[PDB]
Amino acid sequence: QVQLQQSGPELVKPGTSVKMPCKASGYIFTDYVISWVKQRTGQGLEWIGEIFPRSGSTYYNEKFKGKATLTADKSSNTAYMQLSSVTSEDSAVYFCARDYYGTSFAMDYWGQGTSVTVSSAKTTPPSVYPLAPGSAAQTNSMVTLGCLVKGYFPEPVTVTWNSGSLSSGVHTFPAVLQSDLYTLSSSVTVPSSTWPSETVTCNVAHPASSTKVDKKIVPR
Amino acid sequence: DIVMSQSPSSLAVSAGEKVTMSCKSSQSLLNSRTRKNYLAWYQQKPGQSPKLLIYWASTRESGVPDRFTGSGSGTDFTLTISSVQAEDLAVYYCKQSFYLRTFGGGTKLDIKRADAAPTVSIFPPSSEQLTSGGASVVCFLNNFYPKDINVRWKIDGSERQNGVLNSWTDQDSKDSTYSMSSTLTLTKDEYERHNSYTCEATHKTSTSPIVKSFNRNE
């Protein structure tokens, strides 16, 4: 069970350096190269460079020479990428991937990505608000409830319902940015029989501010 | 320093149909000694990191359904998905490893299905929010197809066009539907000077809009 572990979302100020880890397990770290790949929001995958941890040798995409610096710690089976003097052009998700050098030459396992937001705006945690139907009932067999997650910076937040146990019927919407703050909402659709007789709670996580909130949906 | 092109950039088919997408490199990716084209295909779903499908042009990676078939040689390559499934919704990238690595621009795969009308729900502001001086009214338009939909807010019968933010989910991998959120944000004071709040959805499925309403007093 090969697995590549990357750190959580980060907010960095323009002009500074950010150094992110990619922890490998399940295979011989020194027998495969680690490639790194950039993805700007809504955009394609862009190869940054690679490192061979055995030897420390690196190659880069010309565009990232002296912007990215790739390194590898053999004692911890961990690869690092450093972006230097960051600008808003570096706000992106950065994946690491194991790269089968010598044979397939493909990237067969990927990390989840580290989401980097380069900005001067201040980390702000969200206010979570319950969205519960008004005094009416109609097509009563199903009911929709929601959570509004307002005024946070930066991306992203993780919404779940009853700690992931309410899985089906859920729509969590893309955030939209207004004047340095993001807002989204999530909807959950349950049998009219299950609510309010049983509890429904949205769980919001905002990694960048170390925030986790739980909001119970109660009638009215 | 090999440039890669993918075409077409976008694509729609119904479940069960065959699809093919092309990938071109500015140089041959064929190495004479190995006799392999160093070209691979990757699938990227929403919220997900890319997954390797195919390497050496035409070899499937383990775990990948056989309906995904890679083909071609030199500078011109093809990924084919026979019998597309609803789960195949994704962007597909090609990538060269003959010399360094270069990803193609990607080809987005969208699924066609049968028209379906939104389930609309409308929500008045929460007590909490009105406690801090905001009032956001929320309206969810769920599980509809196609993606094109118009939403109209009315306050006391009058169409309202600002303070409105809209957001669409990615298409759903189970049912091939889209959902949309629409959020009308006013100040508390502004919210409290009107009674009836309404969101109206007009969609291809009916010439008659779907209306949901509530009253502050209700």
Binding site: Y59 | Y38, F98
Partner: peptide, 9 residues
């Protein structure tokens, strides 16, 4: 050696 890609296999 660690070569830059497949074209040198």
């Amino acid at each position: 050696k660690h070569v830059p890609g497949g074209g040198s296999v």
